[PDB]
Amino acid sequence: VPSSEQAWLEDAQVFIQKTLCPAVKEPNVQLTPLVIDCVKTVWLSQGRNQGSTLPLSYSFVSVQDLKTHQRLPCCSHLSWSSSAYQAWAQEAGPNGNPLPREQLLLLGTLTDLSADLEQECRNGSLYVRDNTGVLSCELIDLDLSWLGHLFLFPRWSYLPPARWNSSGEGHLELWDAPVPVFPLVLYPESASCLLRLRNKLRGVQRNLAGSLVRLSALVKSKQKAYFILSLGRSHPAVTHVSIIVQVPAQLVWHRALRPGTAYVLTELRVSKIRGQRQHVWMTSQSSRLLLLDPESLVRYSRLLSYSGAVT
Amino acid sequence: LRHHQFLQHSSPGSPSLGLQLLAPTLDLLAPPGSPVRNAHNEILEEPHHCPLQKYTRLQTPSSFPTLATLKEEGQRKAWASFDPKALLPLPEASYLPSCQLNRRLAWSWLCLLPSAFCPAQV
Amino acid sequence: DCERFKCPCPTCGTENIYDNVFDGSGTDMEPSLYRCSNIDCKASPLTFTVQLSNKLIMDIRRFIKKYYDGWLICEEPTCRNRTRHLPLQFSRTGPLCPACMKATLQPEYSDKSLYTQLCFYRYIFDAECALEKLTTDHEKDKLKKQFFTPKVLQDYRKLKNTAEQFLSRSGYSEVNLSKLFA
Amino acid sequence: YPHCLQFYLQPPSENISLIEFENLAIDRVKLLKSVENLGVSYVKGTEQYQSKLESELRKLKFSYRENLEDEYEPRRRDHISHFILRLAYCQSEELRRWFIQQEMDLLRFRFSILPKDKIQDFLKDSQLQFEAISDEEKTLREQEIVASSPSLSGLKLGFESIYKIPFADALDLFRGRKVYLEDGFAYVPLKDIVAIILNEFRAKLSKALALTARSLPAVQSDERLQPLLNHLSHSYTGQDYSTQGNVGKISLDQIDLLSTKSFPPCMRQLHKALRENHHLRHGGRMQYGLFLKGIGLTLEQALQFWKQEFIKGKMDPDKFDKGYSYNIRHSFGKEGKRTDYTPFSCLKIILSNPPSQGDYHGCPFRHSDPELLKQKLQSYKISPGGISQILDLVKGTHYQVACQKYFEMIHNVDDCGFSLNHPNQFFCESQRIL
């Protein structure tokens, strides 16, 4: 086995014990051969190829090194031959070169942050840590039990920067659920009159729950960065309830909260709005939930839903 | 004028020109007076007079065409408008020797405005 | 192999020919009806749509004139007779010359021509198509930004409409299926 | 996916545009030829065989989502397409065969994707007995269904909407002892449903087909429909891709160098031949000649090339002017239009132009006799397994795919990228990969 196939066969001797695991302490044995075999496991699951136990196409490079070596994007799945890969670029539109196939087995250390900063520059959202690269990666959906570990994916999308001096720096696109190869209250309608009066439900932090029905975006600021969500139950019930979220360890929930879905949360503070008699609740730092006529110049618009495509 | 400098976030110390260049538009069309729209007053308070929800007729103030654009444009409009006959009407139309007439009628002028243009180009 | 469109200038006295919508070269390309060809003169024939209209009809109304009066000509490349009094005998290909009794006879302005020519007209007045078929983004956007008003478009639309309706009036684009599958 | 899937019937007596007529003609013929090719390439159930077709078919306007009664666009296109091509193939058994066989397999595929409820309900709309069981009977009759027939394995039979039948049309599902019986209302998996549908379809379809062929003379009194009167399978392609004056500019010297890696067997061998002989017959050059316009070199340059290859082989340096070079030049003149003013397409170097003794113009894969050709091709340093699997298709008298597999091998790339139809397109590709 010369250097060609030794490229893979060295992962049992150099790669995984050095780049895919924290080298601050001992090189885990639960990870190197486990991924060594799991790659062929998910390969031979379908395995359309000619038959080559070495998936030559993929490797591992720290997340903030693509911008040093692959100054271009990378999006792949498993087992696509060059032809079958060339047989996916139409489903909706081929306008412009399709995402490149710089093929790797995307493995990153999951953290609710990226850098060595914890309070001001907090991102909340889940991003990747490695041994020679620490980057952001665009999520899709969040449950709550994947903080502080390492996760791998054969399906993935990446993007190199525009000007490392400018805003447009690199990132990743995450397609599927977090896959680690490691050996692994006040309902809205049922509490419709609690803070409806100020005299009853102010001061301390109380738990709540309900189905998210009306959620806006999450705004930053100089000091008070937050968002305010609204919830309830099914459609023949027009009343909602509202919570607020203003914590660096809680932007995670605007990254996690979704309409049509329901939640059960604890440790949610009150709101005391200055000069405004509009008391409703917020969350706070120590909380964790789980999943549950010329006047017609100016006129007032209406509201409707849709779901379309970037065009 | 380099693009990013002309497109930086304007302020004395880094002022772009589009910051101001639209000044007559900027001012004659929409003066200020309504305080900020806040999450209390967009997502929370009802009723809210938020501007986005309001849809309003709005006529056209202007546009900044190309120098050449106007040049050829005027050229064409005028040249086409070149009625030979209505230059001199009856009866002296038939009261000149074939020399003096073509002599006196070989020249013309005209001028035009932005007002005749929708919008009022500048 | 059809006959082009010739055109009289209303002011400069010169003549013109209108082959393809665009007038020639690539990024330079310009609409046909824009400027009289003669370099110096600066009149712009577009502003005489209606006059063009006239000639259009006053031209087509001789092509049809030919066909319904269609000549008849001989085939055996020696005989070369020209007449209209259609004789009555017949054979595989059709009728037979009276003199060269060993040969067919052919129409002169074969209908295929007539319809071809009317397509040729309707071609160069319907710029919209040729505009859509154009590849390069920036060329398209720039030219449209330049000089495709509703007005110019509308004038093309007008004359093209005259042509197209005047052929589709009734001759040839139809194929009566109700007699084709009985 | 669309309503389209339907059993052809009732010619739609509208009246339409002549342009749209020939359009639909060409479109549908393209679809047919393609489906045939795509099919003979792979095996049926492979997902290439799906992906590629569901790409092409959707591309040519025949399968989209829900719309109005029948004047939805693609279903109408399918409709008039068929009920025209009906007029195409009414003049052979081989022809009518090929047409049937192809439409058959298409309908099979194009139908195999409908949602199950849509499947059963549209079967209902088709004829009477086309009705479904209640899945309770799956539990009630698992023993009967499974133990009865060997056309099902174990207990894991999926939630297929099995069907009630009259035995009177079960005429092979039961006599072969392949189904349970409830008073002739046997219950059979969907597979044989597709089978029987397709068989009755073939029957009824042929039964209709023969009729028009017995009622031709009408068209004989028109000539607008002269191509499709009897002129489809001939020397026009889909269309003129590798037509006059496409991408290319290369100097003379390089030609030979490129030859060894870029000339489709026909050309390549002819160029070797003229490299040796330096003389050619009356017709021969008139293939190679126009083929050169494929890359499109200038006449005086091409004239110079031919001059070199002429007088070095002792062709009188005065004849050249008033002889060969004369017509070689005219090959870009006034008349030649669609006769000379065009390159050639394999379906002109196959379906006609018989090649005679010791001459070279003409499709090797056709005219070259089998085992002489075996050694001949092998002389291109080819693995004999490829040569064998090639000669197989060659005696299958479908050759374009043979040229294809050859190129596939000699450049080792495991996709043909296209479905070849013209040697110059082959050339433009071979230069693309460089």
Ligand code: SF4
């Ligand atoms: S595809 Fe046709 S023209 Fe090309 S080499 Fe094969 S037989 Fe000859």
Ligand SMILES: [Zn+2]
């Ligand atoms: Zn003029």
Ligand SMILES: [Zn+2]
């Ligand atoms: Zn005669």
